Design a protein around this nucleic acid. Sequence first.
RNA 1: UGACGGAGCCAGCGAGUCUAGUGAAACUCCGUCGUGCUGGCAACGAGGAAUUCCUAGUAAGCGCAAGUCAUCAGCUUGCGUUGAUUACGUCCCUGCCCUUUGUACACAC
Lengths: 230, 51, 213, 219, 102, 63, 102, 125, 34, 38, 67
Amino acid sequence: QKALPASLVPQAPPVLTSKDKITKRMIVVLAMASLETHKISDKYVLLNCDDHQGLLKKMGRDISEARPDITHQCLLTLLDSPINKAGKLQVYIQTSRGILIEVNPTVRIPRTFKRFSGLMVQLLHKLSIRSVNSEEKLLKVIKNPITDHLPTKCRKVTLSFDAPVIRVQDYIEKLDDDESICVFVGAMARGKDNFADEYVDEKVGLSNYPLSASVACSKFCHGAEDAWNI
Amino acid sequence: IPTHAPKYEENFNPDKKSYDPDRTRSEINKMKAQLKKERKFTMKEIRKDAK
Amino acid sequence: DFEVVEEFTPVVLATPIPEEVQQAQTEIKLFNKWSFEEVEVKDASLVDYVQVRQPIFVAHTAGRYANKRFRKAQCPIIERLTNSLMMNGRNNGKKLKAVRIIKHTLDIINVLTDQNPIQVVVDAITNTGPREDTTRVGGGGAARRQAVDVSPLRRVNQAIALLTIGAREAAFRNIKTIAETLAEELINAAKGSSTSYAIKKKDELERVAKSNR
Amino acid sequence: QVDDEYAATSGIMDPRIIVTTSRDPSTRLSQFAKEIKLLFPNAVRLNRGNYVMPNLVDACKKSGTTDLVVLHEHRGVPTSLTISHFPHGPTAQFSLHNVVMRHDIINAGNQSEVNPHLIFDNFTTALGKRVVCILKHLFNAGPKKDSERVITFANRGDFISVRQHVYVRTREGVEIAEVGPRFEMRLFELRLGTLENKDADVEWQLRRFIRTANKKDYL
Amino acid sequence: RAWDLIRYRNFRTFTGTERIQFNCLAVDPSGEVVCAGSLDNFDIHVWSVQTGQLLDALSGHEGPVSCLSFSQENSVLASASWDKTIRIWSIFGRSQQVEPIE
Amino acid sequence: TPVTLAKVIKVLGRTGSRGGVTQVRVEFLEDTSRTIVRNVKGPVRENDILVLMESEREARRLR
Amino acid sequence: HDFAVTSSTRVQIFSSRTRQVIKTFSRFKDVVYSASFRSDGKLLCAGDATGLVSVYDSYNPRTILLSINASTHPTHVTKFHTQDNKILATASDDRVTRLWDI
Amino acid sequence: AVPSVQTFGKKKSATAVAHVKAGKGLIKVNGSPITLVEPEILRFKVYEPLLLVGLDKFSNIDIRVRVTGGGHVSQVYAIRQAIAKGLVAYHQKYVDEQSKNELKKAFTSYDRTLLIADSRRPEPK
Amino acid sequence: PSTAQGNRHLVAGLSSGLLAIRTKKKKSNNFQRM
Amino acid sequence: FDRTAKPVPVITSEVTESLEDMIRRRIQDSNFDDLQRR
Amino acid sequence: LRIRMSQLEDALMVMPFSYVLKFLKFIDTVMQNKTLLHSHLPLICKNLFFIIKFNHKELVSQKNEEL
RNA sequence: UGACGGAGCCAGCGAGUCUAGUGAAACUCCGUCGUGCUGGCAACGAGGAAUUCCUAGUAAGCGCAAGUCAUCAGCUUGCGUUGAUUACGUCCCUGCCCUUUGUACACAC
């Protein structure tokens, strides 16, 4: 009795940004990312655990906290997840130095590491990155706090290991038709999972094992895909 | 979702300017900046030794 | 029964005055269209802060309300809406433009929902203003919030602010203008539909206060 | 000694000072005016925009303020200050030449706000005594003798170097530190009425174009 | 000047600094402060009663202060003067607030 | 959730409250004799009504 | 005293005293199908071949009041209620009519 | 020879002189009628001295206003002030004092800035 | 419609692409005192 | 050629230490000049 | 005793009515030990009379024969 | 909050035989369009971290004049027009200051 749509040819999904605070989506926030740049005399680099013996110790910090590889391999996982292709996700990151970066769904993050390093240098110093086709602007540093950009109806949870463990599928179908889900995952190597106490009302976890960062991201994304039938 | 490739220069340097692919407009911008700083320094120095 | 005669000749003037203008000497309506009687504030604690008991002809009372503390609690709430509408760098000072788009949005509020638009905007204020909020109890900067209550002047202030800036961002680059987005916002806020920026923001503030109560 | 239009309330009463900018000031002039209002005490700043100078003067001299400091700029860099003493008193208007301000340089902390000590160096002429009186009756009378901020108006050939210092007195001398704006101001005009008119009689104004101009000081 | 009506002694005398003659006064309800206005000075003189000192000189009338009265409940000062102006001074507690009614 | 209304009878002074937050003493309207100490955010004065989502909670200081 | 004629991709209101087009509505994307006035004669609904009911106010073609996005099929008939004022009935090539509160 | 009355209405730099005398009932601002006073959204700011007290007070008198200076909204505020206090002064001088202070009570209950401007400002805090 | 009160119209729009309207239409004060 | 007036003095290290040890001497011996209460 | 006289009327105004009721219990116990009643009579009188004078409206609406 | 195209209107400054006055703009009304950037493979669609200032004719918008022995024209100072939001409480944080016999005469503390 119910008719078809008038057009069966599949449109691309509408790519969502911070200029659409209405649509239900999944925000993933990579917190405490290690994205800092530094001078060599002549050259700029992104601070690794491996490009130096003691540039980090000359800057004062310890070398174990200069890990951009793990926010790289989280960003790859989130932007190759099917929910990003279906257009129900956008990726915000926030550096441990307090710099918020909005990551478009339409971006193609480069697959090797030092290509991503050379991308992050120009992002951190030019505050904006255009496409090669130069029609839109698809990786940009925006203004803190993140709650100015998150949707107006959005439950904000954070991910940890010591928390009441839930299942992502029934947890996401608990929330209602216009509520989004903002999942603060920590992109540290180690640290207390308190990076977003001031934004978050629910601190949850996914396993009973010490869960890696991109594995936690992929677990929450696959649960969201099953909950939204993707 | 469509997937665009990001445009960025390799071995980026903020202190150096961007590599324009024209050697007769990057050159005029370079030498405009050069005449501005040398003219400013020159007439600053001649008015302060006049003082 | 009993009847008073108090005019004794049909009043006619040498300058011709329009019939609706000389009809306006029996009741003061806003823009000569929208009556101020039977406009109640359907939520107590906000009566004596949303003022609808001195009727006006236009939202341009040039009176001085910013030289004592609660004196802006008796500026008429149409004019408080107008003054809050004329704010950003682009539209500062332009009170006549703000009055004109308030006139347009009350006309289209009435033509969509066929009821009194002053009653609609008063219901929107009393549904939008949040009844609880969180301050940041410091401890030097320990990121913990403590739920406080919130006074009715702050509720009317934040109600007008949420409504007007919701109309701005809803008109930011869509086909609709500020008058039509503000009309949609005031209608949805009046009935309380949770499709408005304003009462979604109220529900978030009240829910966060319920959370870290 | 205290002259004929300051002698009624020389040390009886504290002053009351308004500090205000020229018209639609730049941000560095607003920072500069905040620095001047917390250079000298019982001074407050007033946002001049769309203020007429006659009714500004009338509102000040019926509210009871003693004097007014109006600041003029040039693209951030402040260039003039006019001091108008209100009970039909004098206006000394100055130009400012080498201005370095702490809001420009360094977050070195906060200032001290004590009733300061005052140093006046070689104001030898009667015009020097006049400008000393007009510059120091905008300060609070009778500080404590252990007040630890001093300011200095030192004449250096008609260019009053103006600085502010804090000090402790150590075992072998005294150790000084520089707070607040340094200037060299120079008086280009005195006149005997307030700022409203410019029909007032001039007590002194510098003659730039006479041929014996650069032969003497306080000419 | 103030008069004890128990020991019948003038225990307090308040003068200004300007040698003016006072034409009206007003006291606090909680009698910490006396207040007085003249017809040749345009100021209002505010004295503490506990100590004897001149606590303030309120300025802002442009005509001789004809009358003074303290509100008996909320303790706000109302002065009114021959410049066609009544004026309301919030003296107590950090305000220093002035409201002129023409 | 049933809500309740409470009129301010006394703005409490010299409490050591955090700035922008003022303690206040409100009595109810359904039984206008019993009070409770709340602490509000915006500007408040006497005999104005404010809305309590709960009344089972006395207010401490904030600091 | 006025009537709206729905041609392809425009709706023209003619006057009943001059019989010329007083006003015209041309900002439709596909063929506009139905165009009727409300019972108060204050606003004008037009169903369009893209299933976008757009209701303007009559005698002002520049203020589109609201654009109901009905079915993806062409909407072929749109008329307000004749008793009620705030409900609009649109049937389309979706074999289902809809009552919309405006 | 005629009973006439002149008043003044001022806002920021606009100023309006209103002559009220006995007549047929015509209210004219700058020669043109009162129903032409632009910006046309504040025409009811100009009208409210008439609609607050009824047109039967204006049925026997003719007012003329000459408005110079100022801007649009300062001129409509000068016009309404001049009209209001001119009606009050006419009913004082040539009609009875009871209608005089009834008019003063009605205008003062609406806003006393129809009758007394806010004139000398600022405050030096 | 039923209350037209003026120039009354019958309009018919054709499939040919044109519109057909057929309407039915509808000394001195001294001397006067004398 | 000739000029109108002596131009504005460029502040040097020697003149800033000149008025600096001047005010060192001055605030050492406390021979400064303020107002006095009446 | 150790609170001061300038902030005593604020210290007694801050506390709610449950603390007023247990303050009345404290006064009721302390005037059985007649040693420290008589050494603090004007302090007990001042505090107790300000407390019930400030909280008089609620106190006379409490219904309990114990109080 | 646009772009075209017409129309209505409202100021206050300023008068050396000297220069090489009438009038403002924002605003108001009436027709028309219709909202995905730039080149001979560069920038850019309201500007990050931080930081500064600000309480009524105030912030901000808008134009018009002058050019006053210093300063200014790579601009400066006037003048009007339009005109708000939020504090107007508090020492909780950051600081700065004051006092620690009550003295000054009662009463009270």
